[PDB]
Design a binder for these strands. Structure first.
Length: 280
DNA sequence: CAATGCCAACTTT
DNA sequence: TTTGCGAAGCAAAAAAGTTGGCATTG
């Protein structure tokens, strides 16, 4: 067939698998990129690497590696239904990508927290909850008061299905955060069905929280190496503090893994220990 | 205005 | 992260999070 017409067949395939909405979207976007990037011909290995290197060229290595993967799978499916016989993607180079996002430190957190003094109250409250519970923003915006029962905040992580009970008697010492104290302030000051509500006592979207955290960051005027820290970085911050304040085991469970494997990268400092000397 | 949601195109977990 | 394939560790699969730009409405 033609690449395009086959991409259409491939996505209908993908539409199955049991994939979640967001996942499908991620895949669709990689397929849409392939379109713009390649002709409609039938059959190119160099034609393919031409596209990929075009991404690695402008520093979008992550995308390159993700596209390459999707292209290759589309090809294996084509070879299966018998349309092609060679996976000209296999003969291509798997691009190397390193996380550019820098980790956030306890001190940096305090500065962003102050800089957030110019933001709605839910921001700072969202920041405290994020660090004391080590949960993903996506879940934090789901927490309803009905989820708290007898000193425990029940959480069924959306991304993994993992189910955990977080004790409210919790608190982070290095930062002076008491979960019960934070929760109270959340009930009073915000007052919504969700523990994290908007100015209009309505449910917030992870996207917004992220975004306001980002504003406050710039507002703090802090400098970072590589891509700046984002709201998700509080998850890792949470882990790394709790590791020291309690134990690696504890931090693992709080974060929530299926594996029961204490591998974890949230515990990694990713160089923040090192102090790169300026040059005033 | 300013707070928010939505679509998109990237990067992370 | 989690799974997969091969049996130690990366590559790939699945499902987020990040944030600019446009549009909407208190």
């Amino acid at each position: 067939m033609t690449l395009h017409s086959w991409l259409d067949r491939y996505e209908k395939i993908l539409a199955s698998r049991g994939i979640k909405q967001k996942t499908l979207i991620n895949y669709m976007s990689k397929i849409k990129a392939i379109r713009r990037g390649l002709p409609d011909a039938p059959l190119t290995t160099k034609e393919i690497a031409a596209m990929l290197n075009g991404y690695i060229d402008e520093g979008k290595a992550a995308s390159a590696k993700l596209i390459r993967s999707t292209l290759s799978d589309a090809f294996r499916e084509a070879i299966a239904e018998g349309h092609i016989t060679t996976n000209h993607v296999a003969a291509t180079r798997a691009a190397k990508s390193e996380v550019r996002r820098s980790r956030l430190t306890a001190d940096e957190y305090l500065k962003i927290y102050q800089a957030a003094e110019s933001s709605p109250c839910w921001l700072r409250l969202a920041m405290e909850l994020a660090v004391v519970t080590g949960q993903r923003v996506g879940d934090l915006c789901e927490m309803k008061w009905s989820d708290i029962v007898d000193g425990y905040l029940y959480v069924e992580q959306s991304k993994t299905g993992v189910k955990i009970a977080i004790p409210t008697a919790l608190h982070i010492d290095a930062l002076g955060i008491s979960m019960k104290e934070t929760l109270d302030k959340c009930k009073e000051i915000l007052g919504g069905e969700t523990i994290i509500a908007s100015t209009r006592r309505e449910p917030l979207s992870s996207g917004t929280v992220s975004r306001y955290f980002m504003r406050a960051r710039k507002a703090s005027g802090l400098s970072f190496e590589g891509d700046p820290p984002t709201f998700h970085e509080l998850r890792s911050l949470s882990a790394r503090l709790y590791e020291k304040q309690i134990s690696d085991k504890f931090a693992q469970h709080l974060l929530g893994h299926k594996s029961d494997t204490m591998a974890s990268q949230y515990r990694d400092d990713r160089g923040r220990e090192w102090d790169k000397i300026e040059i005033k």
